[PDB]
Swiss-Prot record:
Compartments where located: Secreted; Target cell membrane
Keywords in alphabetical order: Amidation, Amphibian defense peptide, Antibiotic, Antimicrobial, Cytolysis, Hemolysis, Immunity, Innate immunity, Lipid-binding, Membrane, Secreted, Target cell membrane, Target membrane
Assembly and oligomerization: Adopts monomeric helical conformations when bound to bacterial (anionic) and eukaryotic (zwitterionic) model membranes. May also oligomerize as homo-dimers or -trimers in Gram-negative bacteria mimetic membranes, and from homo-dimers to -pentamers in Gram-positive bacteria mimetic membranes. Adopts an antiparallel dimeric helical structure when complexed with LPS micelles. This dimeric helical structure may interact with the lipid A domain of LPS.
Family in the record: Belongs to the frog skin active peptide (FSAP) family. Temporin subfamily.
Name listed for the protein in its UniProt record: Temporin-1Tl
Expression by tissue: Expressed by the skin glands.
Shown stretch of the complete protein: 1 to 11 of 13
GO CC annotation: extracellular region; membrane; other organism cell membrane
Superkingdom per UniProt: Eukaryota
Amino acid sequence: SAFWQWFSKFLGR
């Protein structure tokens, strides 16, 4: 993924 969201693009708080 691109933006962060529930650990989408990689890892999003």
